[PDB]
Amino acid sequence: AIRDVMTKFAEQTTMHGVPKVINAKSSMGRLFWSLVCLAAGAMFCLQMSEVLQRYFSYPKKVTVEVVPTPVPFPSISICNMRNLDVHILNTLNRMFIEDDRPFSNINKSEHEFIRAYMKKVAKYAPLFWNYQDEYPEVFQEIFSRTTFSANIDPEVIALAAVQLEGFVVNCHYAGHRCNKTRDFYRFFDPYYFNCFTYKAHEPTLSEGIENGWSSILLSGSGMLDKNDEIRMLPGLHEWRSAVSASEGVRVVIHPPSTTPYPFTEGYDVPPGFSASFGIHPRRNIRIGPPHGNCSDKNPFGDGTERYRLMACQKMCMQHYIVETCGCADVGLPKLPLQANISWCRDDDNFPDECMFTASEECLQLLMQLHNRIKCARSIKSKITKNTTAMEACNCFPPCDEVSYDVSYSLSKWPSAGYEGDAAYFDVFGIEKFNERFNKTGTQGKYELFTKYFNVSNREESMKDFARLNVYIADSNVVKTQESEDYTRNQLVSDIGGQLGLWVGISLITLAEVLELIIDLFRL
Amino acid sequence: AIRDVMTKFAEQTTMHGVPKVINAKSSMGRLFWSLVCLAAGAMFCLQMSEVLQRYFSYPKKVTVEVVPTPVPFPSISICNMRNLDVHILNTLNRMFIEDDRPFSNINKSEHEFIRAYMKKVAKYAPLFWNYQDEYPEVFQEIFSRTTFSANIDPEVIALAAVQLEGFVVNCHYAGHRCNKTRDFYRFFDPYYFNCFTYKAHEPTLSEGIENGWSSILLSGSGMLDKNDEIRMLPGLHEWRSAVSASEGVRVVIHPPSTTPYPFTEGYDVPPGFSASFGIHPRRNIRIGPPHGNCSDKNPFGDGTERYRLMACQKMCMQHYIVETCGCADVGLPKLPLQANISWCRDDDNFPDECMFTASEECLQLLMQLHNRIKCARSIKSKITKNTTAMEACNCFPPCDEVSYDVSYSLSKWPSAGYEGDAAYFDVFGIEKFNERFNKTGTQGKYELFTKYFNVSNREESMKDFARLNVYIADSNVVKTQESEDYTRNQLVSDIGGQLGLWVGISLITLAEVLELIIDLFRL
Amino acid sequence: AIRDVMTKFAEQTTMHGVPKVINAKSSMGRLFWSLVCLAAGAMFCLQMSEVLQRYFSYPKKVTVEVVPTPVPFPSISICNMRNLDVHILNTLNRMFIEDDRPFSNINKSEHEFIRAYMKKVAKYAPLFWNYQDEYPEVFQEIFSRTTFSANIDPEVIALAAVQLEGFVVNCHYAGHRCNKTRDFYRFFDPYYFNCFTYKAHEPTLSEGIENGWSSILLSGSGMLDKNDEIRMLPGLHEWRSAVSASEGVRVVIHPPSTTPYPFTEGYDVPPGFSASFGIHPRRNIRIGPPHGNCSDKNPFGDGTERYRLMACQKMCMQHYIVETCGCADVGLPKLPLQANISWCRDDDNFPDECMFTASEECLQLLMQLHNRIKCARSIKSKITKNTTAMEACNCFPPCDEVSYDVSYSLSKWPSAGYEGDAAYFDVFGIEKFNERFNKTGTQGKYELFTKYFNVSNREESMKDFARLNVYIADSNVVKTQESEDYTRNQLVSDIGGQLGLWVGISLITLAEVLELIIDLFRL
Amino acid sequence: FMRF
Amino acid sequence: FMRF
Amino acid sequence: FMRF
Ligand SMILES: *[C@@H]1O[C@H](CO)[C@@H](O)[C@H](O)[C@H]1NC(C)=O
Ligand SMILES: *[C@@H]1O[C@H](CO)[C@@H](O)[C@H](O)[C@H]1NC(C)=O
Ligand SMILES: *[C@@H]1O[C@H](CO)[C@@H](O)[C@H](O)[C@H]1NC(C)=O
Ligand SMILES: *[C@@H]1O[C@H](CO)[C@@H](O)[C@H](O)[C@H]1NC(C)=O
Ligand SMILES: *[C@@H]1O[C@H](CO)[C@@H](O)[C@H](O)[C@H]1NC(C)=O
Ligand SMILES: *[C@@H]1O[C@H](CO)[C@@H](O)[C@H](O)[C@H]1NC(C)=O
Ligand SMILES: *[C@@H]1O[C@H](CO)[C@@H](O)[C@H](O)[C@H]1NC(C)=O
Ligand SMILES: *[C@@H]1O[C@H](CO)[C@@H](O)[C@H](O)[C@H]1NC(C)=O
Ligand SMILES: *[C@@H]1O[C@H](CO)[C@@H](O)[C@H](O)[C@H]1NC(C)=O
Ligand SMILES: *[C@@H]1O[C@H](CO)[C@@H](O)[C@H](O)[C@H]1NC(C)=O
Ligand SMILES: *[C@@H]1O[C@H](CO)[C@@H](O)[C@H](O)[C@H]1NC(C)=O
Ligand SMILES: *[C@@H]1O[C@H](CO)[C@@H](O)[C@H](O)[C@H]1NC(C)=O
Ligand SMILES: *[C@@H]1O[C@H](CO)[C@@H](O)[C@H](O)[C@H]1NC(C)=O
Ligand SMILES: *[C@@H]1O[C@H](CO)[C@@H](O)[C@H](O)[C@H]1NC(C)=O
Ligand SMILES: *[C@@H]1O[C@H](CO)[C@@H](O)[C@H](O)[C@H]1NC(C)=O
C-alpha cells in the first residue's frame, strides 16, 4: 500500500508542488511538475547551505554611540624624567671633583645609596681608565640607569630617588586640596626610579580646579652644578634611548587599578610650561571565543590588577627573552613564576680584583655582560614582528576596556612680571615650599633651594616648575559595543522564510511529512 | 450547527495543522495532531512575544562614513591670557610705587577703570595691612580677577582690557587680508576680560594662507615692569586655579553661532611659538524621544544661539548654585529668568568706614564674602557627580552637532637670524604695528612699544608674539548618524515570517478565520 | 472553457484567497472575498514597490573593529624649515656686507648656486633700490623662496640646500642604527628645498629605540650671523605665509609609497625639544561605484605611487590654475601631460637692461609677474569652495586607505647639567658629528661648527638640536569597512516573506499560475 | 609685609 | 633704505 | 680622558 499512503498524503497535504506531482494525470504534466518540484528543492538546499554556513561564520556586529554614564576619573601617574634627587646628584659630582677615584669614596658618606653606588662603580673604574678610548660604546651602556636599577636594591635607590614632598609642590582635585600621603602611591620603575600614581578621592579647605586635577611639579634641572669639563656620572644617562637626556614630567593617564608603563606610554611636559590634558573617555565592550576573541584575565598574571593588553604583550616578550638569552630584561615585568631568573644586566660575577686591575678576565666579563644586553635587545626588537610567537601567547584584547583620547596643549606657566610674582609668592610664601626641607635629614637641600630660588632670580628659577591640568572634556562617553551579528532566532526566521518561499513547507507540514514517514513504517 | 461550520472551514481552510485535527478519523491521530497544533501555536506565541517586545525596546542603530560635503569654517575665539592692557598694568604698578595707599590714588587718574579699581581696592586696604599674615588665603581670593569682573561694570573694564588693535597684529583668511572691524566680534568673559571671535568672510588685496586662517598675536608680558620686590596687584591673579599665571593665547574652535567657554574648553599657545591646528571635522545626527534622546533647544535658554550640551550643563550648575547658596557664580552664564540675583562675589555691602579702619564688622563682612565663595565652589564641584540633579535638568545631546578633532603642533616662530629679521620687518615696517598707538589716547603705549621693540633687541622682543594657523586637514567629514534599528515594516515582515513558519497562516487566512467566527455568529 | 480551466486551478491551487473567490456560492460572499483578495494584492504591491526601490537605493553598510593585523611601519618625511645651508647663508650675508651690489658678486664665488642666485637677484636690484618705498609688498613677494625654486634648476639648489649628513645627527630603528645612505631618500619641495623620507628597513650594531624610530636632528638657526641692521636676503623668506619665519622640523607621517606634501600636512617640532609621536593606525575599506564611490588610481596621475585623495585634489587645483591664469603654480604638482607649461613665477622674460636701469619696461614686467602670482593665489583660494569644479575632477576616496592618528607631545631634550653633558658627549665625541665636515668641500662649515658647538657653550648651542620619536602606540588597528547593506539574497528573502504574508504564493505557486496561463493558451 |  |  |  505504498501507493495508498502516498495518495493519502497527496490529497491532504499542505506542501505545494508535491501534490500536483502525485495527482498529475498527464504524463508530460507529471514530468513538468516533478522537474519543478525537484528544481525548487535544489535551490532551497543551495540557499539553506549558504545561510547555515553564514551563521557558522559566527559573525560579529558593532555599534557606536555617546552615552551620559560617567566613567571613574582616571589614575594619573607622574614621573620626573630625572631619576635621582638634585642634592644627591650634586653630592656625587662634588665627591668626584674632590677625588675622582670611586674606590676611595666608598667610606666618605653615610648615605646607603651613595655607598652602594660607589662600590658598584669601583668595579669598573680601572677598565674605564684603560679602555674607554677603545670601547666607548661599551662603557656608555654599562653605566646606564637600568644597570643600577638591576644591581642595587630598589629600597636603597628609593632613598636617593626623587621624593614626593620634593616633587609635587601643590595638588588639587574637585575643588579641594590633595592629601599627598593618602592620594599618591609610589612605585618603582627601572628608568624612572621613583614614580607616583594619583588615585582620586572624591569630596567628603576648598580651593583649586573645580572640574578636574591640577598640580604644580618641580621638574627642571637648573640647580645642578654646571661643570667646566665633561665628567662621567654613571646611572644618570641611558645611552642611545628615546627618552634620554630629556627634562620634564612623564604623565600616564590610565584606568584605575592598572599598572602603568611610563617607558612606552604616556605624555611629556617640559619645565616652564603649563600642560592641559583634555580627556575624552572611550569605552569598548567585546564578545567571547565563538563570536570573537577577548579576555578578562592576564594569561601570565596573578589576576590582581585590571587587564590591559600591554601587560600580556610585555610578559610575553619577557618569556621569550628568558627562553632565548637565559636572563630577564630589567625593563619588563618579572614573570611571577620565575623569580629565580637573573636580570641580564647583573654584575655580581665581577671579582674584587677588578677594583684594582684592568686584567683580561675583567675585560672578558665586561664584554660578556655587553653581549647579554645585546641578546636581550635583539630579541625585544625582533619578537614583535613574529606573529607566530605573539599568537602563541594568547594576548586577546580586554573584554571591557576604558580608553582615553587626550588633547594636548601647552602654555608658558610663570608669566613675566606681576602675574609671575603672584605665582612665586603662592609657592614660596603661602605654601612655603622650601621649608619642607628644613630638617636634619635635608639641610643641604634646604640651603640649595634657599640660594637658588631667592626672590632676585625668580624669572629664571621658576622655569624649573611645570603645571599639569587633567580634566574630562566631554561628559558623555563614546561607547563601542560588539554583538553577535546572526542570532539563532534570526537563523530560524530566515530558514523558515526560505522554506516558505521555495517549497511552502511549515513546521506543521514537517510534522505532516513525519506522519507520512511513520505511515510508511506502519505499512 | 457548530460541527457544521467547523467542518466547512476545516475542508476549505488554508491553515496547516487545524485541518488534520478537524478531519482526524483516528482517536490517537486526533490526539497527536491536537498536540502538534497547540504546541506550534504556543511556540509561535513565544517568539511573537519576544519580537514584539524587542520592537518595543525602541532600539537604536548607527552608521559611520566619510562624506564629501564641506562644513562651514569654524568660528575661532582668541583670548589673551593676560586680562588687562600692558600700559594700564604699568600705570597701576607705578602708581602703587609712587604711593602704596589706594585711597590717595582715586583722584590721580582720569581713566574710569583706574578710578573704579582704586575705589574698590581701598575698601580692603586696612584689612590687608592688618590681617594678611593671619588670613593670606582670604585676601588672595578676594583680590582675584573674578571679583573685579563681578563688581565693576564690564563696559568700564572693556576700556582697560586688551584691545583688538593691540592684540591681532595681522590676520589672513582664504588668501585675503582680514577686515578686523567686520570680522572680529568682542565678548566679555569673567576671567579673560576681553575675548574676540573671528567669523569667516569668504572672498568677494590677495595675500596670506590660501587654505585656512592665520594670524599673528601679541601675547607675551615681557614689556611689564620687573619689580625688585613682590607687590600686591589685585585683579591680575586668580588664586589656586588651573589657568593661573599662564602666558599665551587661549584658542577655542567651535561651530558658528555658538557661545564659547574659554575657561573650560579650548587650546593654549605659548608666546614665541607658532601653533598649527589641523581641524578634522565631525558631524553627528541623533534621533528623538522614543528611539533616543536629543534636543534642538536649550531648556534654560532663549533659543537665539545654536544648542551645545555645555550651555545646558552650565546653566544647570548655575541653577543649583543659586538654589543652594542664594547667589550666582560669576564664572557661569546668568540665568535669563533671574537677572535680579546678585553674584556671590558682590561687595556692595562694605561700609565706607572699611576704607579707614580694620574694625571687626569689616572683618566679618570679609569672612562672609569668603564663605559665599566657598559655598559656590563646593556646589560646583559636588553637583556634577550627582546624577539625579543632572538628570533633572533635561540636558540631552544636540540632535545635529558638528565637532572638531584638533591636531596640535608647535614650532618656534621668529627664527634666529635673517628669517627673523624679515619677520620683524614685516611687522614693524610694512604693517607698521607700533604706529597704531600714535594717538592722543595711547601715546604712552606708543612710547613703551617704541622703546621695547626697537631693532637692537628684536631677538628678545619678538618672543612676545605668537602665531596661529587653523586649517581643515581633511576635506571629508566623518559623519555619524543614528537611526531606528527595528522599523514597523521589519516588525510586520518578521511577524509574518514567524506566522508562516509556525502555523502557516497568512493575512488572507486571517480573513478566513474571521469568516469562520462570523459564521459562528450567524449560527 | 475559460470557466473550465478557471475552476480546475481553483480547486487544486495553493494560492490563498483566489480559491474562496472562485468557489464562492453566495453573491455577497463573492463580493467580500474578491474585495479581500484585491485589497491584499494591492498592499503586497505597495510593500514590494517600497522594498524594490530600497534595494535600488544601492544602500551602504559599515563596521568598525580592532584587529591584531600589524600595518607596515609608516614612512617618515623630515624637512628642515630652513631651506638653505647655514654656511651658504652666512656666505651670502657676508658677501652682501662686503659689497651690497649683486651684479658685482656674480664672479666672486665658484659655487654654482651662488652664481645663479646673484644673477637672478641682479635683475631686480635697481628696481628694489628705486621703488621699495612705493611697492614694498611687491618686492617682498618677488624675493620669496618659491620664486627661486621656480627659476633655478633644482639640481643646482640641491647643492646649497640642507644636506642629509648635516641634518640627521643620529638615527635608530628597531634596535639598530640606520644606514643613512640606504634608508633616507631625498626629494625636492618648492618651499622646503630639500626633504628626506625614511623608508623602514627591518633587522637582518644593536642600539637605540627597540619599538620604533628615533633620530636627533640639527634644526636651529643659532649659528647664523646676527646683523646690526635689517638687510634684504632674497630666497629665505616667504611673505605672508602660514609657515613663514618658523624654526624647527616639519614631520609628515604617511603610508609607504606615497608622495608627501609638507606644505599642507604634517607636524612641527621646535628646536631644543624632544617630540613623541604616538601612532594609532587606522584602516578604511570602501566599496565601488554602484554601492558607493572609491578609486584605486589617480585620474590625473601615472599610477606609480599609491593613491591619496590629496594628490587628486592638488592636481585638480593645478588643472584649474593652468586653465584660468595660463600658468602653473610651483607649489603644486606639475601635471604630467603639460610639461611645457611655464610656472607663474617665471622671470626669463626680464631683459638684461634691468640689471643696470630701473626703466618703466622693467617695472611693468615686475607688476605683470606680481599679477600672475595674484591670479594663481586667487584661484587657489576660490576653487576649493566651488563644488561643481571639484566634482568635475572625479576625486573619489581611496578604496583601501591607511590613516595615522598621531598623539603629540614635547619635552626639553638636552637637560641642564650632567644629563645634558652626556648628551653633548654622545653627539660630539662618540658620533663625532663635527668631523663629518672636515673635508675639502666643507672646511668653512667645519670651522663654524667647531667655534660654535665648543664645550664651554653647550648649554646654549645644544638648543639648536631636536629629537623625534615615532612609535606605534597601539598594536591593534582600528578597521572601518564598508559593505552592501541590502544584498540580492536579502531582497529575494524579503520579497518571499512579503509574498507569503500577503497572498501566500510560493514560487511553486508561481509555476502553478504559469500552468494556468499556459492552460488558457492551450484553450 | 606685602605692600600694594 | 633696506640694503641687500 | 673622561675622568669621573
Ligand atoms: C591627611 O593628612 C594628614 C596630615 O598628614 C594626616 O594626619 C591624615 O591621616 C591624612 N588623612 C588620611 C591619610 O586619610
Ligand atoms: C581568535 O583567536 C584565534 C587564535 O587563538 C584565531 O585563530 C581566530 O581567528 C581569532 N578569531 C577572531 C574573530 O579574532
Ligand atoms: C618566530 O618565533 C618562533 C618561535 O620563537 C621561531 O621558531 C621562529 O624561527 C621565529 N621566526 C623569526 C623569523 O624570527
Ligand atoms: C628652620 O628651622 C630652624 C629651627 O631648626 C628655625 O630656626 C628656622 O627659622 C627655620 N627656617 C625658616 C626659614 O623659618
Ligand atoms: C639668587 O639665586 C641666583 C641663582 O639662581 C644667584 O645667582 C643670585 O646671586 C641669588 N641672589 C641672592 C641675593 O642670593
Ligand atoms: C573694512 O574696513 C574699512 C576700513 O576700516 C571700513 O571702511 C569698511 O567699512 C570695512 N568693511 C566692512 C565693515 O564691511
Ligand atoms: C532618555 O532620557 C530619559 C530621561 O529623560 C531616560 O529615562 C531614558 O533612559 C533615556 N533613553 C535613552 C535611550 O537615552
Ligand atoms: C543630589 O541632588 C539632590 C537634589 O539637589 C539632593 O537632594 C541630594 O541630596 C544630592 N545628593 C548628593 C549625594 O549630593
Ligand atoms: C606720530 O604722529 C606725529 C604727529 O602727531 C608725527 O609727527 C610722528 O612722525 C608720528 N610717528 C611716526 C613714527 O611717524
Ligand atoms: C631696545 O629695547 C631694549 C629692551 O627691549 C633695551 O634694553 C635697549 O636699550 C633698547 N635699545 C635702544 C637702542 O633703544
Ligand atoms: C650601508 O652603509 C655602508 C657605509 O656607507 C655602505 O658601504 C653600504 O653599501 C650600505 N648598505 C647598503 C647601501 O645597503
Ligand atoms: C558618487 O559620485 C557621483 C558623482 O561622480 C555622485 O553623483 C553620487 O551621488 C556619489 N554617490 C555616493 C554614494 O557617494
Ligand atoms: C565654479 O567653477 C565653474 C567651472 O570652473 C565656473 O563655471 C563657475 O563660474 C564657478 N563658480 C564660482 C562661484 O566660482
Ligand atoms: C681634520 O683633518 C685633518 C687632515 O686633513 C686632520 O689633521 C685633523 O686632525 C682633522 N680634524 C680633527 C678634529 O681630527
Ligand atoms: C664657544 O662658542 C660660543 C658661541 O657659541 C662663543 O661665544 C665662545 O667664545 C666659544 N668658546 C671658546 C672657548 O671657543
Residue numbers in the entry:
A (entry chain B), B (entry chain C), C (entry chain A): 2 to 205, 211 to 529
D (entry chain F), E (entry chain D), F (entry chain E): 609 to 612
Paper text:
Here we dissected the structural basis for neuropeptide-gated activity of a neuropeptide-gated DEG/ENaC, FMRFamide-gated sodium channel 1 (FaNaC1) from the annelid worm Malacoceros fuliginosus, using cryo-electron microscopy. We solved high-resolution structures of FaNaC1 alone, with full agonist FMRFa, with partial agonist ASSFVRIa, and with both FMRFa and pore-blocker diminazene, identifying the ligand-binding site and elucidating the conformational changes induced by ligand binding. Each subunit comprises a minimal N terminus and a nonresolved 63-amino acid C terminus facing the intracellular side, two transmembrane segments (TM1 and TM2), and a large extracellular domain. The FaNaC1 structures presented here capture a ligand-free resting state, two ligand-bound desensitized states and a ligand-bound dilated channel state.
In solving the FaNaC1/FMRFa/diminazene structure, several 3D classes emerged during our image analysis, with two predominating: a closed-channel class similar to the FaNaC1/FMRFa structure; and a class that differed from the others with dilated mid- to upper pore, and some probably nonprotein density in the channel pore. We focused on this second 3D class, resolving the structure to 3 Å resolution. We easily modeled TM2 helices into the cryo-EM density and observed an ~1 Å increase in the pore radius relative to our other structures. Although the resolved density in the pore was too small to accommodate a full diminazine molecule, no such density or dilated conformation was observed in the diminazine-free FMRFa-bound dataset, suggesting that diminazene binds and affects FaNaC1 pore conformation. Given the drug’s effect on pore radius and its voltage-dependent block of currents, we hypothesized that this nonprotein density derives from partially unresolved or low occupancy diminazene molecules. Thus, we interpret our FaNaC1/FMRFa/diminazene structure as an FMRFa-gated, diminazene-blocked, open-channel conformation. In its binding pocket, FMRFa draws the C-terminal end of α2 and α3a (distal finger domain) 3–5 Å upward and inward in the direction of α6 of the adjacent subunit, whereas the N-terminal end of α2, α3b/α3c and all of α6 (knuckle) are relatively static. Extracellular domain rolling pulls the β-turn at the proximal-thumb/wrist domain outward, which couples to upper-channel expansion via β-turn H297 interactions with TM1 Y59 and TM2a E490. Lower-pore dilation is similar in both FaNaC1/FMRFa/diminazene and FaNaC1/FMRFa structures, in contrast to upper-pore dilation, which is present in the FaNaC1/FMRFa/diminazene structure but collapsed in the desensitized FaNaC1/FMRFa structure.
